[PDB]
Write a protein that binds this ligand. Structure first.
Ligand SMILES: O=C(O)c1cc(I)cc(I)c1O
Ligand SMILES: O=C(O)c1cc(I)cc(I)c1O
Ligand SMILES: O=C(O)c1cc(I)cc(I)c1O
Ligand SMILES: O=C(O)c1cc(I)cc(I)c1O
Ligand SMILES: [Ca+2]
Ligand SMILES: [Ca+2]
Ligand SMILES: [Ca+2]
Ligand SMILES: [Ca+2]
Length: 582
């Protein structure tokens, strides 16, 4: 019995989750407002839902969630003061009003860094568990306004489980701290991934997210029929769409239905689902996401048969380009759980091009007969790139490898801003640690997938106020060729070196008194600057400059009166460095 969307969401999801989803919505839309105020919004909106559960015909209950929510945003008194043109949105009609609001969501918000102090935290948690859960929802959402919401609730539960276990113990910090750092990695990954999903939707169509999904599921569910994989992909894709347009109640609902659909059909999807399908809802959906792949069906025809050798290939393609191509991507991926989905979509796109050309020619079959070998370079390229880069990772270690990446990338695209260059090169530096030690069967999936993620963060940060047409080009050409494209950029000698700014290379006694993250960043920032100033420095010249810098920092940190020391050796470094790079 459903004619009120908000009555329906509230009945299906239940009050606790409803409130969590609503809090998240607001925290993602108004990233600057106090936690209190957001709680008040969530409570008025939840009472209005209750009134609707009670009478589904009460005035307003027929209104979509975007309508009701947007209406709540439009009542915030501090709205124009705190967010400006975001308040122009109020003069639009739905869906435009929600598109313009979406468009103000800040991807790199100027916010204090989260640094946990176990006593205050353990105390707050004992005082009020729900409210604790809630500020978690809040701060994380504030920092990731596109966080996949039902998954953020899952993490808020685990967060709670960790605090419930550890606060009991004697050494809180030693219990809390490792667990919180591990989870912080997992949250940052999660965040990245959903940002890529939304941005892909927003820039390349739903069709791209769909293709990716066919590839992913066809990998996990190699036995499932193309029809089943198709249905899964449709529902799952709709889920991502609702979450990317900010309708969280609906995304969480459709997701709960998907997990019900899956746990109810294991027999035609996968034998690896027995475990997952016995957990409570959030845990269940999460487990379904990360599930181990099932066995590949034992005797399978070669791909060559139906896609290169058959005589009707062109005819079949021509009757249903999409189903034919969908079938290609499905059939390739169920056989290769060891290729990265990025590679798989590249193979598929190559296949489409090959066909678009050959099916037009006088004798198509000879043109398409030999396509698979033409497909070979798309697998060879990134196998090689991986081997090569992990070596560099072996000797240098994380931070050495990051310095190489900062060098590479700064030469590559120097019109790009220092903070982004830095953030992105560091993150790229994490790929070796995350992947290189891996047994070969994962290594390509592991690296390519991670890089799409980091390169998407580059695009999203660059799209905002674009400075490198080179970047814009790599980011917006094809979603799937981002990596190769970026790998393919060579440095530019038209690039006129940037004028010398003393401000950029003056260092003070504060650097000794920095959390290490801030140390490495201050340095890495300096390195990026130097390379925008001296585009053509060489690897040895740069290594030496580095040696001089670390000697200098160590020296001045070590004296009991350091400000004098920096005040004196600092310009000595500048001189020396300018002489070396003269
Ligand atoms: O991302 C954070 O800022 C963050 C902060 C805390 I405290 C705990 C976890 I898990 C996080 O992911
Ligand atoms: O990404 C998800 O949230 C997700 C959720 C469900 I339920 C099932 C699969 I396969 C997924 O990939
Ligand atoms: O940075 C790259 O170009 C790169 C590309 C691939 I594919 C794998 C690894 I490890 C990399 O470091
Ligand atoms: O999980 C996904 O469905 C997904 C979708 C896209 I588009 C890109 C990456 I990396 C992903 O992991
Ligand atoms: Ca910003
Ligand atoms: Ca909707
Ligand atoms: Ca709907
Ligand atoms: Ca439902």
């Amino acid at each position: 019995t459903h004619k009120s969307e908000i009555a329906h969401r509230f009945k299906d999801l239940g009050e606790e989750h409803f409130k969590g989803l609503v809090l998240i919505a607001f925290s993602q839309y108004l990233q600057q407002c106090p936690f209190d105020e957001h709680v008040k919004l969530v409570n008025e909106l939840t009472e209005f839902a209750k009134t609707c559960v009670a009478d589904e015909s009460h005035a307003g209950c027929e209104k979509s969630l975007h309508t009701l929510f947007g209406d709540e945003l439009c009542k915030v008194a501090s709205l124009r003061e705190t967010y400006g043109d975001m308040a122009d949105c109020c003069e639009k009609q739905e869906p435009e009003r929600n598109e313009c609001f979406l468009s103000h969501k800040d991807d790199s918000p100027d916010l204090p860094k989260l640094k946990p102090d176990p006593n205050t935290l353990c105390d707050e948690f004992k005082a009020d568990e729900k409210k604790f859960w809630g500020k978690y929802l809040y701060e994380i959402a504030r920092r990731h306004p596109y966080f996949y919401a039902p998954e953020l609730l899952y993490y808020a539960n685990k967060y709670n489980g960790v605090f419930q276990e550890c606060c009991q113990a004697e050494d809180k910090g030693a219990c809390l701290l490792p667990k919180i750092e591990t989870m912080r990695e997992k949250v940052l990954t999660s965040s990245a991934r959903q940002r890529l999903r939304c941005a892909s939707i927003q820039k390349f169509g739903e069709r791209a997210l769909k293709a990716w999904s066919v590839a992913r599921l066809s990998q996990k569910f190699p036995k499932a029929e193309f029809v089943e994989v198709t249905k899964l992909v449709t529902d799952l894709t709709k889920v991502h769409k609702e979450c990317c347009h900010g309708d969280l109640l609906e995304c969480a609902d459709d997701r709960a239905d998907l997990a019900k659909y899956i746990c109810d059909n294991q027999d035609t999807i996968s034998s690896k689902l027995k475990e997952c399908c016995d957990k409570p809802l959030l845990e269940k959906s999460h487990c379904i996401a990360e599930v181990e792949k099932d066995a590949i069906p034992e005797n399978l025809p070669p791909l060559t048969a139906d896609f290169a050798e058959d005589k009707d290939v062109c005819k079949n393609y021509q009757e249903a380009k999409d189903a034919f191509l969908g079938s290609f991507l499905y059939e390739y991926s169920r056989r290769h759980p060891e290729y990265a989905v990025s590679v798989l979509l590249r193979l598929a796109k190559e296949y489409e091009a090959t066909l678009e050309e050959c099916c037009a020619k006088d004798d198509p079959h000879a043109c398409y007969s030999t396509v698979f070998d033409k497909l070979k370079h798309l697998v060879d390229e990134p196998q090689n790139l991986i081997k090569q880069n992990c070596d560099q990772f072996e000797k240098l270690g994380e931070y050495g490898f990051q310095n190489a990446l900062i060098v590479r990338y700064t030469r590559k695209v120097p019109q790009v801003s220092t903070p982004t260059l830095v953030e992105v090169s560091r993150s790229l530096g994490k790929v070796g640690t995350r992947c290189c030690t891996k047994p070969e069967s994962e290594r390509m999936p592991c690296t390519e997938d991670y890089l799409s993620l980091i390169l998407n963060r580059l695009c999203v940060l660059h799209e905002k106020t674009p400075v490198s047409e080179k970047v814009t080009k790599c980011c917006t050409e094809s979603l799937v060729n981002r990596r190769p494209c970026f790998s393919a950029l060579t440095p530019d000698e038209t690039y006129v070196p940037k004028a010398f700014d003393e401000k950029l290379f003056t260092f003070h006694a504060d650097i000794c008194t920095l959390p290490d993250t801030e140390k490495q960043i201050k340095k890495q920032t300096a390195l990026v600057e130097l390379l925008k100033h001296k585009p053509k420095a060489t690897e040895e010249q740069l290594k030496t400059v580095m040696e001089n810098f670390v000697a200098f920092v160590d020296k001045c940190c070590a004296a009991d009166d350091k400000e004098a020391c920096f005040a004196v050796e600092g310009p000595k470094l500048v001189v020396s460095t300018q002489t070396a790079l003269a």
